[PDB]
Amino acid sequence: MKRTFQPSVLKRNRSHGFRARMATKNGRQVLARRRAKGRARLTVSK
Amino acid sequence: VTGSGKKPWRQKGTGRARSGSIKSPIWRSGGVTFAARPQDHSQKVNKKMYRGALKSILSELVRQDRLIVVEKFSVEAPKTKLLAQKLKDMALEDVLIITG
Amino acid sequence: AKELREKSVEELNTELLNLLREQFNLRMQAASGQLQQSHLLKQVRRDVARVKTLLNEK
Amino acid sequence: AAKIRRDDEVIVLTGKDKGKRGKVKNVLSSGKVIVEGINLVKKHQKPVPALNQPGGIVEKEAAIQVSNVAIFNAATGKADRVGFRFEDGKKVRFFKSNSETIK
Amino acid sequence: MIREERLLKVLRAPHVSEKASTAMEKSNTIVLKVAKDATKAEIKAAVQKLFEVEVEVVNTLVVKGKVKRHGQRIGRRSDWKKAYVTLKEGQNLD
Amino acid sequence: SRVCQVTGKRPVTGNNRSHALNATKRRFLPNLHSHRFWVESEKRFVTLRVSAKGMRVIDKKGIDTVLAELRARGEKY
RNA sequence: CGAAGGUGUGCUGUGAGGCAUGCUGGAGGUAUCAGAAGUGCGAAUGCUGACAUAAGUAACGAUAAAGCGGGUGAAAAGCCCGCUCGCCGGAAGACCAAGGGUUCCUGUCCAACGUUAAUCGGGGCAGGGUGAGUCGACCCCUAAGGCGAGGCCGAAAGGCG
RNA sequence: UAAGGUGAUAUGAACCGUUAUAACCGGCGAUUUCCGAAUGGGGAAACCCAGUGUGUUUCGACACACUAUCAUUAACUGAAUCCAUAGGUUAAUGAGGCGAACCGGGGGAACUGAAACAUCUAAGUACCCCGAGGAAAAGAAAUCAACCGAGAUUCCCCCAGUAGCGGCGAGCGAACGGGGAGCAGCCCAGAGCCUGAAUCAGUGUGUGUGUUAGUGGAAGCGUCUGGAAAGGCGCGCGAUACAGGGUGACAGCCCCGUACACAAAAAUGCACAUGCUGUGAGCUCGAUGAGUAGGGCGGGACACGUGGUAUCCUGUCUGAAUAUGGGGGGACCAUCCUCCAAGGCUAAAUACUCCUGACUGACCGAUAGUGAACCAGUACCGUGAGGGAAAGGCGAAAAGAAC
Ligand SMILES: [Mg+2]
Ligand SMILES: [Mg+2]
Ligand SMILES: [Mg+2]
Ligand SMILES: [Mg+2]
Ligand SMILES: [Mg+2]
Ligand SMILES: [Mg+2]
Ligand SMILES: [Mg+2]
Ligand SMILES: [Mg+2]
Ligand SMILES: [Mg+2]
Ligand SMILES: [Mg+2]
Ligand SMILES: [Mg+2]
Ligand SMILES: [Mg+2]
Ligand SMILES: [Mg+2]
Ligand SMILES: [Mg+2]
Ligand SMILES: [Mg+2]
Ligand SMILES: [Mg+2]
Ligand SMILES: [Mg+2]
Ligand SMILES: [Mg+2]
Ligand SMILES: [Mg+2]
Ligand SMILES: [Mg+2]
Ligand SMILES: [Mg+2]
Ligand SMILES: [Mg+2]
Ligand SMILES: [Mg+2]
Ligand SMILES: [Mg+2]
Ligand SMILES: [Mg+2]
Ligand SMILES: [Mg+2]
Ligand SMILES: [Mg+2]
Ligand SMILES: [Mg+2]
Ligand SMILES: [Mg+2]
Ligand SMILES: [Mg+2]
Ligand SMILES: [Mg+2]
Ligand SMILES: [Mg+2]
Ligand SMILES: [Mg+2]
Ligand SMILES: [Mg+2]
Ligand SMILES: [Mg+2]
Ligand SMILES: [Mg+2]
Ligand SMILES: [Mg+2]
Ligand SMILES: [Mg+2]
Ligand SMILES: [Mg+2]
Ligand SMILES: [Mg+2]
Ligand SMILES: [Mg+2]
Ligand SMILES: [Mg+2]
Ligand SMILES: [Mg+2]
Ligand SMILES: [Mg+2]
Ligand SMILES: [Mg+2]
Ligand SMILES: [Mg+2]
Ligand SMILES: [Mg+2]
Ligand SMILES: [Mg+2]
Ligand SMILES: [Mg+2]
Ligand SMILES: [Mg+2]
Ligand SMILES: [Mg+2]
Ligand SMILES: [Mg+2]
Ligand SMILES: [Mg+2]
Ligand SMILES: [Mg+2]
Ligand SMILES: [Mg+2]
Ligand SMILES: [Mg+2]
């Protein structure tokens, strides 16, 4: 079939990337809710 | 109990019991059903009741002679072996020395 | 350290000039099969460290 | 401030080798000192052909605690428990029993 | 011009391989494991001035290191640059 | 926004009561206009988002006094 | 000279129960009396961890097909070589952009992995292997569309431009 | 400060060092590539591309400094037009982001309970957003009181679940006044006076006392079992040290510390004295903060909710006396009492603990304690926000089994 995950790096870095988390002020709180619980995979940039 | 209020699974359907949380107080790593808070324990007893208790305790020590009376008892140097050997040759074992 | 502790910077110019090359010869013999001693590297690195310390002061 | 050091003649207080005498060889600050010829424990070396380690049994000394031994002063021939004092501007250790300054 | 601190700090080792010896013996080429921040206009300017060898071209690349499974730990080695550097005709380094 | 540039008025909320006194939220917007007001100490005009009350206020006091409180308040003219 | 815990053996009350010693066990524990209880379990298709039956039973994942002689090996149906047979040949042949990230080659090992055996491996370990003026990315310029100094408009967030 | 060290996983290697430059040790200055407010533009964050200037220059490339944006000040070239203004172009100072809790400003919700639900409750509760701080908000009479009075807010206990509010249903809930911690009052709305006069220190000093390393610091031996004394038996000893932990099992006197008493070259805090970058007290005169109190209209806060409702904040419309005066005293007048907004400031009593040091537990021992006693926000599962585990034990010392 045509399954759910169809992978693309140039879409993933623009959707769930760090510079995607950049401009949205409601996303700065998301980064500040991952740093302040201390995860290793902060965002899915590589 | 740190997690979230999400169910494990939906209620009806698969053949198990109606689970409710990952903080379930009958589960492993669950909660405690009647956990108690940081509290106090001091009761209150009266002025009259406390002084009556003191007058009650000041009687069997007389009737059993575990209270003894001495006028002067001290030492003239800050040294503990002097009181140790004073109690030694006074021949007492467990003393409560109340000064004036 | 007490030799270099007084020294002038014009000495340190030629001293660094030979010193980095002595570190390089030392490390290329650490690469090849002649150096069987394992302390001169740690010597020469702190040797460059102790003069790069004083190069700010003078 | 080391009450027992690396190059002294020391007596074992208690344990298996109580009362016996011997010299310390070298020292570890985890609370263990090598004292020579005291506790001969077994070891079974594995024979490797590298560096010519042929194996065989080796009876080696065992390390032992600093707080299980005390110094062996020939001025008493007994248990001397070292103290400290200052002479001539340096820490000099003396003997708290029989009052001999170690020099 | 290029300064002697970089000129001395840029090389790291000569490499050894069954692949390396063939380019040694056929084409008068050296096989250098170099640091990662090396450029072709600088490796040549180091080995020309220092070792007194006539050189013209450098063919860089990057070897990437593998993942080695240390029991219940996992680890991956480091980026290190290689360089196949062909010397001009008439020099043999010892 | 609604920068009432004389008196500083602001949309406050409140209620919308029914006649069974059922209530919902609302707003209370202030009256504004956009006046090209005429001043004498510079002999030209100046744009202003005055309120309804501020138009009474300005001709009561003066215009140079409004410039004086304004440029020291910080917000422009 | 042997405590808790475990284990058995007599013996004792109306019962919750109590008593000591045989064995393992190798540092701990309790009297009478009063004081605080996260205080007693079979059941909640309850929770987490281990073990049964069904049962050494159905299956071993394309009905394209294998047979024999030699090597290596502690034993070869599957490994290497040899030569008979078969199957695709607009694919199951020969390459790249996607995506994965040593799966690539060279020695060595068979414990888990492989739906069987297993010397073989895409498995474990170690060592080598990715060379550009011309070929792909940056690079000069844009399309949809994103941001957008000032600017306008929203309670702040901001919304457009 | 001292004979030991080159961190651990986890052992070999060339080693330093023994009477003081071996290393852990506290303070002081210097080193800190790139990403991130990222700030020279750009970007799919750890990548790419440039400029001006000072540099040398084996004509060959490198070194370093600089440069966003607005907030506010000066300049200089300053449009439609001559003066005027927008507007750029610099230079200087300031601001960006960061994280537990408490505070306080703009908004603002539901299941629920009423055994139904709509007024109401849940509640100004959860949550968004903004700000200044280690405190913040207030605060020094248009208060309260009954014709006796008390004299600002803040903050704890009462009067009390009472007089009120309420489909007078569910429930909401004060004050006057008393008892406590703490109590400090002040200057602006100036024409002329003393001339640098208290005041606050942001500062000049050092002291007291910390603080960031330290130092000394008491006092037992023989024997009975045991593999092992710390045990069992004797006779001792120190106690302004019987807090604890460790060493082959239960120790005051084997090790560290414990009582006590000292230590700082540098740097710093809190209380002090002293001219300081700027202080104007005190003293006579006065004036007494205008689109402002009020009123009408719809809401919200006051315990006040299809009211007899005081009072205060404002969206909108009209708005006077001004000390002879103006307000309030639970509608309203009359009579007395009390006090002067429209301009601000101010210590402590008050809350919380990501973070630092100690001490304590009728707290729990690996399904109990945070989720994590072990490399836990990890392997893993979800494209993403986000959710999230199982899992400790040889030994006295590994001496870990030569052959
Ligand atoms: Mg949900
Ligand atoms: Mg768990
Ligand atoms: Mg729990
Ligand atoms: Mg000891
Ligand atoms: Mg290349
Ligand atoms: Mg409503
Ligand atoms: Mg005015
Ligand atoms: Mg037995
Ligand atoms: Mg038992
Ligand atoms: Mg039992
Ligand atoms: Mg045991
Ligand atoms: Mg034990
Ligand atoms: Mg114990
Ligand atoms: Mg059970
Ligand atoms: Mg039952
Ligand atoms: Mg059940
Ligand atoms: Mg089964
Ligand atoms: Mg079975
Ligand atoms: Mg069968
Ligand atoms: Mg069958
Ligand atoms: Mg065959
Ligand atoms: Mg077959
Ligand atoms: Mg065919
Ligand atoms: Mg066909
Ligand atoms: Mg492989
Ligand atoms: Mg292989
Ligand atoms: Mg297998
Ligand atoms: Mg097999
Ligand atoms: Mg392969
Ligand atoms: Mg393999
Ligand atoms: Mg070429
Ligand atoms: Mg091309
Ligand atoms: Mg476009
Ligand atoms: Mg825009
Ligand atoms: Mg903008
Ligand atoms: Mg080490
Ligand atoms: Mg940048
Ligand atoms: Mg940028
Ligand atoms: Mg570009
Ligand atoms: Mg609702
Ligand atoms: Mg409802
Ligand atoms: Mg109801
Ligand atoms: Mg305040
Ligand atoms: Mg009065
Ligand atoms: Mg001590
Ligand atoms: Mg000490
Ligand atoms: Mg007035
Ligand atoms: Mg009004
Ligand atoms: Mg009215
Ligand atoms: Mg109205
Ligand atoms: Mg009023
Ligand atoms: Mg009245
Ligand atoms: Mg006032
Ligand atoms: Mg657990
Ligand atoms: Mg257990
Ligand atoms: Mg995954």
Curated annotation (Swiss-Prot), chain A:
The organism's place on the tree of life at top rank: Bacteria
Claim: Ribosomal protein is one of the keywords in the record: yes
One Pfam family, short name: Ribosomal_L34
Gene Ontology terms: biological process: cytoplasmic translation
PROSITE patterns per the UniProt record, alphabetical: RIBOSOMAL_L34
InterPro entries per the UniProt record, alphabetical: Ribosomal_bL34, Ribosomal_bL34_CS
GO cellular component: cytoplasm; cytosolic large ribosomal subunit
Transmembrane listed as a keyword: no
MF terms in GO: structural constituent of ribosome
Keywords: Ribonucleoprotein, Ribosomal protein
Cleaved signal peptide residues: none
PANTHER family listed in its UniProt record: LARGE RIBOSOMAL SUBUNIT PROTEIN BL34M, MITOCHONDRIAL RIBOSOMAL PROTEIN 34 FAMILY MEMBER
Subunit structure: Part of the 50S ribosomal subunit.
Family the UniProt entry places it in: Belongs to the bacterial ribosomal protein bL34 family.
Protein name: Large ribosomal subunit protein bL34
UniProtKB/Swiss-Prot annotation, chain B:
Record keywords: Antibiotic resistance, Repressor, Ribonucleoprotein, Ribosomal protein, RNA-binding, rRNA-binding, Transcription, Transcription regulation, Transcription termination, Translation regulation
GO biological process, one term: negative regulation of translation
Annotated region described as Disordered, given as residue ranges: 1-20
One Gene Ontology molecular-function label: rRNA binding
One GO CC annotation: cytosolic large ribosomal subunit
Complex and partners: Part of the 50S ribosomal subunit. In TnaC-stalled ribosomes forms part of the binding pocket for L-Trp with the leader peptide and uL22.
Note: The erythromycin sensitive allele is dominant over the resistant allele.
Cited function: One of the primary rRNA binding proteins, this protein initially binds near the 5'-end of the 23S rRNA. It is important during the early stages of 50S assembly. It makes multiple contacts with different domains of the 23S rRNA in the assembled 50S subunit and ribosome.
The family this protein is said to belong to: Belongs to the universal ribosomal protein uL4 family.
Name of the protein this chain belongs to: Large ribosomal subunit protein uL4
Source organism per UniProt: Escherichia coli (strain K12)
Encoding gene, per UniProt annotation: rplD
Shown chain mapped onto the complete sequence: 52 to 151 of 201
Swiss-Prot record, chain D:
Highest taxon listed in the record's lineage: Bacteria
Any single GO CC term annotated in Swiss-Prot or TrEMBL for this entry: cytoplasm
Recorded GO MF terms: large ribosomal subunit rRNA binding; structural constituent of ribosome
Gene Ontology BP annotations: cytoplasmic translation; ribosomal large subunit assembly; translation
One Pfam family linked to the record: KOW
InterPro entries the UniProt entry points to: KOW (IPR005824), Rib_uL2_dom2 (IPR014722), Ribosomal_uL24 (IPR003256), Ribosomal_uL24_CS (IPR005825), Ribosomal_uL24_KOW (IPR041988), Translation_prot_SH3-like_sf (IPR008991)
SMART domains referenced in this protein's UniProt entry, alphabetically: KOW
Statement: the UniProt record of this protein carries the keyword Thylakoid: no
Self-association state and partner proteins as the record states: Part of the 50S ribosomal subunit. Might contact the SecYEG translocation complex when it is docked with the ribosome.
Function of the molecule: One of two assembly initiator proteins, it binds directly to the 5'-end of the 23S rRNA, where it nucleates assembly of the 50S subunit. It is not thought to be involved in the functions of the mature 50S subunit in vitro. One of the proteins that surrounds the polypeptide exit tunnel on the outside of the subunit.
Protein name from the UniProt record: Large ribosomal subunit protein uL24
Taxonomic source organism: Escherichia coli (strain K12)
Curated annotation (Swiss-Prot), chain F:
Top-rank taxon: Bacteria
Keywords: Ribonucleoprotein, Ribosomal protein, RNA-binding, rRNA-binding
Alphabetical list of Pfam families matching this protein: Ribosomal_L28 (PF00830)
Keyword Calcium: no
Molecular function as annotated in GO: rRNA binding; structural constituent of ribosome
Gene3D superfamilies: Ribosomal protein L28/L24
Entry GO terms, CC: cytoplasm; cytosol; cytosolic large ribosomal subunit
GO BP term, pick one: cytoplasmic translation
Keyword Metal-binding: no
Family designation: Belongs to the bacterial ribosomal protein bL28 family.
Oligomeric form and interacting partners: Part of the 50S ribosomal subunit.
Protein name: Large ribosomal subunit protein bL28
Organism: Escherichia coli (strain K12)
